[PDB]
DNA sequence: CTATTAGCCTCA
């Protein structure tokens, strides 16, 4: 063997095969994106290819070209530069597809001709083939080695000294030797897995430090054979084939486990059937474990209280990012007094658990009759959760709720889980360049497990290693993006926020205790894909329905377009036309006389009754016949009659047609031994109809994936090409997802003359035909379900409901009602009924029909006639398709055209409903967020972040009141309106948020526009306009379809618009303004100082003459607090745009006029006239005079 | 107080 890299010197890198029209479509947008964006950037190419035209071949050609380019590039640099190789992947969901793709790639490597001459020599082929690895699961991995290989590994490492390992190997080898029956293979697989778990563990244990066994010669080859992932690390190979489940786990090498998700720079991924990966990623997310919310609190509070005294090298600036966590923990623990245990006070009220659910933004649903509160009792020394007094009023509780405690515990846990990523990132930052203690090169992936293990070690929290690994990376990838906070100043969405679920059931072990379980979902598959693209990976997805219009059975492409932007590449019209021309050229139906017939059939009762009476003539009634001989009950009569009649009519219609040989009837249930009576009835009918004509028919029942893997699909192939007749196959929609390629060999002797080829050019390979008659039934339940545990199904259902609400297919009222009904127990029937009223159902049904139709037919030998039978319930759904028919299959368009001819149909646009629902949701979220922020601002001391948030919101609303383009950062402050610049609404901003009406539905409601806020009259002032120009505020409203929500037009805009006006007017007459000293924030406008006078004057401003229900003790409390904290002082109450003809009242602490000398509050009616835009010098003159000795 | 079920890969 002389396989070396240097061999490729004498080989021309200029001859290429003929570029197909399907090839430039992949290379051109990539080049455009490279020249527009940077060299190191991500992308996403949803390629809508079609079955039977070639999708795997093009991807394999692309992979081969990339490998050749890498090999070419590696030779040039040689010595002047050393780095790693590019990584390339091929990921799917099925093992058979993986092995078939690898075999096809290898075969393509062997055989390839340019101008009738082999492209590569034998040594070149060997070198290329020595670069691809395949990584199956561990248990199957152990069953491909040999005795000599594993013996060599054991002897080289000096492991043939313990009797246990050798005994286990001998037992496994013997059991493998004698293993033919199907009930011992499971034990063999389990034993192989458990042996592989310990072996690689020992190999890593020995060599992760001293006494490193050198690898060379044949021992290196043996270790590489046993560990395919070892070849990648050293640099031997840089191409991998694996499944999606393995991709999210990683593969082992001699040092540790390498996770592909954690190092994706300069990598290329190829995923086929990309739309189906949504459910796989959802299952992987939902398979997570739960966690009791009070055991970890105790462990974290007790084991982190005090530590030892040892800094040591390596560690540097790790404790600095942990002190705030302890500060928060102590503050949280010294409020509820969590040291005490938990109990409940109720008179036999623990039969059933109180579930608690939350969305973390604006949705909160509980299944308790009355709200529960938490209290601390100093008598019994225990914390209790109780409903307290049931009497009306009597000092109703307002301190807090259990939901608040749950949310606080959850946010504490999330913050703890999140700080470790930054700590480890800083640790690798100092290690890499700031330490250089050991010469190892490597990246974050190399020194990852050691750091987390050591830290779990330093603070000893080992029982948390599994909890922290799931959500560990360099930065994010599983939690939020951008601002990394759930605030109004950052982009908000469900796809990177998640949900929460908490249950309170009875606690066993100790009867006088309660438990609090929790399940989490930190992200959604769309967010995961977005993070993968952002990290710097080029993703290329191949599928035929990659851009479906559903969020249950597909990715949410509306969210990806608002986060990626220019990195989501799309094709133009010319490229689609070229693809369309290629597909017609390769499959031409407007020639050779190929025709399709489509027929919708209904249900009949005389037909079935006559057939039943002919079946058993000894009986008197059909009801007795069905109740006695068949297994159906009294309830199941109409449904069985309908579907059986439809199937029998379709079968009879097919049998009547002479020139046909194949039939596949897609159904929704499997026809097995459980339905033997119905099978016998169908067989009798088939025999009768075969006798009526002159044909021989053979029927196949119970065709499952198990039947495919036990008997095989080749039985039909032999039966079709040896004996003349007709074949009928019974199967299911889901069954034809694991068994592919339903073809068979042809025979010109047995077949007639109707085998016309459809391709316009000569066709290579063998001769094969496909199905020429199919029966389609209306699909049933399309709500995803999980059968792993009890919590996974509930998590899936809540995720589906939240996604449906977020997309815009559900109003907040309907979503809340559905969540409440599901939380407290629901049946599948009610869930399906609720789901049937949306617009996603029709899209899902249409996608299912298109996928089912497309998979039938992969050859060029089509019969003269093809018959299609469709259920009568699909007419309305298939009659409402209005996309463009450019990439449609030749049979789906026929269905649409036939269904559309049934009269004229009224179609209601989804847009109007989407805009209405989104406006409602935005208004509700704004209301709740503003209320929460205002409540937070009133708890002294006020945080710095809250003040920054408030100021940024006010400044953004002042500067830009109408944005032309869709905002990205300040997202949920605007709503899209049909009219530009103004809109109408109707609601009360004191009650139920989901009771608002918008736009055309109310023509006599309140108005939000520029003419209502009185902007022009204010702007005309000569003392205010220069201020507005200096600060850059808007002097007029632009005309675009993005306006602020009604909540922001009344409680935010008016106040600022008045405040700046009064400040600008008053600042000229020797007045200065300051900021509130953080103690009474939001209770007053500014602080006023002038001429160095005692008792500093506070200012309060309002925009217009607003009367509110504030005559209660709120004003007295405010004035008392100000007087206590600052002594005697003076206060100014100012309005704007009123009447400059009303005198000035002198007020005491209350609003009753008193003596001018003994006065503290000034009520100034107005300063700027609303008629000619004048001002009021007399008012300010009297103001200045009043500040004197009086 | 309505609709009407089959398939899957990985590891503690």
Automatic annotation (TrEMBL):
Entry protein name: Helicase/UvrB N-terminal domain-containing protein
Natural source organism: Vibrio cholerae
């Amino acid at each position: 063997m002389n396989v070396s890299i240097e061999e490729f010197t004498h080989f021309d890198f200029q001859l290429v095969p003929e570029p197909s029209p399907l090839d430039l479509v992949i290379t051109e947008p990539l080049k455009n994106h490279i020249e527009v964006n940077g060299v190191k950037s991500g992308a996403l190419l949803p390629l809508p290819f079609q079955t039977g035209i070639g999708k795997t071949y093009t991807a394999l050609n692309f992979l081969l070209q990339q490998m050749l380019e890498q090999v070419r590039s590696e030779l040039k640099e040689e010595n002047t530069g050393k780095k790693s190789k590019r990584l390339l992947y091929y990921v799917t969901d099925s093992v058979d597809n993986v092995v078939s793709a690898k075999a096809d790639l290898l075969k393509l490597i062997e055989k390839q001709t340019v101008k009738g001459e082999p492209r590569f020599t034998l040594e070149q082929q060997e070198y290329l083939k020595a670069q691809i690895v395949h990584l199956p699961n561990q248990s199957e991995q152990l069953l491909q080695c040999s005795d000599a290989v594993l013996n060599d590994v054991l002897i080289g490492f000096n492991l043939n000294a313990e009797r246990d390992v050798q005994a286990e190997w001998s037992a496994i080898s013997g059991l493998r030797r004698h293993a033919s029956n199907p009930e011992v293979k499971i034990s063999l697989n389990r034993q192989a897995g458990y042996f592989y778990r310990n072996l690689i563990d020992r190999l890593q244990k020995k060599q992760k430090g001293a006494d490193r066994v050198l690898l060379s010669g044949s021992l290196l080859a043996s270790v590489e054979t046993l560990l395919p992932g070892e070849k990648i690390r050293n640099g031997s190979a840089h191409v991998a084939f694996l499944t999606t489940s393995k991709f999210l786990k990683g593969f082992h090498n001699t040092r540790s486990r390498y996770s592909p998700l954690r190092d994706l720079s300069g990598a290329v991924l190829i995923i086929d059937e990309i739309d189906k990966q949504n459910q796989v990623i959802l299952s992987e997310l939902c398979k997570q474990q739960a966690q009791d919310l009070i055991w970890a609190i105790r462990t974290l509070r007790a084991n982190f209280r005090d530590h030892q005294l040892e800094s040591s090298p390596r560690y540097d600036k790790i404790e600095d990012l942990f002190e705030p966590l302890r500060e928060r923990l102590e503050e949280f623990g010294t409020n509820w007094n969590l040291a005490f245990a938990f109990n409940t006070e109720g008179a036999n009220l623990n039969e059933r658990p109180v579930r608690l659910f939350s969305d973390r933004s604006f949705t909160h649903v509980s299944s308790a009759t009355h709200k529960l509160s938490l209290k601390s009792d100093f008598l019994r020394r225990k914390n209790l959760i109780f409903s307290d007094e049931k009497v009306e009023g009597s000092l109703i509780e307002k301190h807090g709720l259990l939901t608040r405690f749950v949310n606080e515990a959850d946010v504490i846990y999330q913050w703890f889980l999140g700080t470790m990523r930054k700590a480890v990132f800083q640790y690798w930052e100092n290690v890499r360049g700031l330490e250089i203690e050991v010469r190892e090169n490597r990246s974050l992936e190399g020194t990852f497990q050691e750091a987390v293990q050591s830290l779990l070690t330093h603070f000893n929290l080992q029982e948390f290693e599994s909890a922290v690994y799931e959500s560990f990376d360099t930065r994010g990838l599983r939690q939020s993006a951008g601002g990394k906070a759930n605030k109004l100043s950052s982009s908000k969405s469900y796809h990177h926020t998640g949900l929460k679920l908490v249950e309170v059931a009875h606690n066993q072990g100790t009867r006088d205790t309660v438990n609090c379980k929790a399940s989490f979902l930190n992200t959604s598959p769309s967010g995961v894909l977005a993070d993968m693209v952002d990290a710097g990976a080029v993703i290329l997805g191949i599928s035929a329905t990659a851009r479906a219009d559903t969020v249950i059975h597909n990715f949410d492409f509306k969210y990806l377009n608002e986060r990626l932007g220019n990195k989501l590449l799309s094709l133009s019209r010319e490229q689609k036309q070229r693809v369309n021309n290629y597909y017609h050229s390769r499959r031409n139906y407007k020639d050779n006389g190929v025709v399709l017939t489509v027929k919708y059939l209904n249900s009949r009762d005389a037909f079935l009754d006559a057939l039943l009476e002919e079946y058993k003539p000894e009986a008197r009634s059909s009801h007795f016949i069905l109740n006695h001989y068949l297994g159906i009950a009294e309830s199941e009569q109409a449904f069985v009659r309908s579907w059986l009649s439809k199937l029998l009519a379709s079968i009879k219609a097919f049998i009547s047609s002479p020139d046909n040989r194949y039939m596949l009837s897609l159904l929704n249930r499997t026809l097995d031994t459980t339905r033997q009576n119905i099978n016998d009835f169908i067989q009798f009918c088939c025999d009768k109809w075969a006798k009526e004509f002159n044909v021989k028919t053979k029927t196949f029942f119970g065709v499952n994936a198990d039947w495919m893997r036990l008997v095989g699909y080749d039985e039909i192939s032999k039966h079709l090409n040896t004996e003349l007749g007709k074949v009928v196959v019974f199967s299911t929609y889901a069954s034809m997802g694991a068994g592919k390629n339903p073809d068979y060999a042809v025979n010109l002797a047995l077949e007639g003359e109707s085998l016309i080829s459809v391709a316009d050019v000569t066709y290579s390979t063998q001769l094969r035909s496909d199905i020429d008659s199919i029966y389609l039934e209306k699909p049933t339940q399309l709500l995803l379900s999980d059968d792993y545990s009890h919590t996974a199904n509930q998590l899936c259902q809540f995720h589906q409901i939240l996604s449906l609400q977020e997309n815009g297919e559900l109003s907040p009222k309907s979503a809340e009602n559905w969540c409440r009904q599901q939380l407290m127990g629901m049946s599948r029937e009610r869930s399906l009924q609720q789901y049937h009223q949306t617009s996603d159902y029709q899209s899902a049904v249409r996608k299912y029909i298109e996928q089912a139709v497309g998979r039938a037919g992969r050859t060029s030998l089509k019969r003269k006639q093809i018959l299609l039978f469709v259920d009568s319930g699909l007419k309305e759904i298939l009659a409402e398709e209005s996309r463009d028919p450019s990439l449609f299959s030749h049979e789906y368009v026929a269905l649409v055209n036939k269904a559309k001819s049934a009269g004229k149909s009224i179609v209601e646009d989804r847009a109007v409903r989407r805009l209405f629902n989104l406006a409602q949701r935005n208004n509700k979220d704004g209301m709740l967020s503003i209320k929460a922020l205002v409540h937070r601002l009133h708890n002294q001391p006020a945080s710095k972040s809250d003040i920054q948030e408030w100021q940024d919101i006010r400044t953004q609303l002042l500067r830009y009141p109408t944005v032309a383009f869709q905002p990205e950062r300040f997202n949920r402050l605007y709503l899209q309106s049909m009219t530009k610049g103004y809109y109408r609404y109707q609601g009360n901003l004191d009650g139920d948020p989901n009771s608002f009406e918008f736009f055309d539905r109310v023509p006599y409601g309140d108005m939000v526009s520029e003419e209502d806020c009185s902007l022009a009259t204010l702007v005309q002032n000569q003392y205010v306009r220069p201020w507005f120009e200096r600060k850059g505020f808007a002097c007029s409203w632009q005309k675009e379809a993005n306006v602020m929500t009604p909540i922001m037009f009344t409680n935010i805009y008016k106040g600022a618009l008045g405040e700046q006006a009064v400040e600008a007017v008053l600042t000229a007459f020797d007045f200065t303004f300051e900021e509130v000293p953080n103690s009474i924030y939001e209770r007053f406008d500014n602080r006023v100082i002038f001429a160095g006078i005692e008792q500093p004057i506070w200012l309060d401003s309002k925009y217009w003459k607003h009367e509110g229900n504030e005559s209660s003790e709120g004003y007295s409390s405010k004035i008392a607090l100000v007087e206590e904290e600052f002594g005697p002082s003076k206060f100014i109450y100012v309005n704007a745009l009123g009447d400059t003809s009303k005198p000035i009242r002198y007020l005491n602490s209350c609003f009753v006029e008193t003596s001018p000398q003994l006065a503290k509050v000034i009520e100034i009616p107005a300063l700027i006239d609303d008629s000619n835009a004048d001002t009021n010098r007399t008012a300010v003159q009297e103001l200045i005079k009043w500040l004197h000795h009086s």
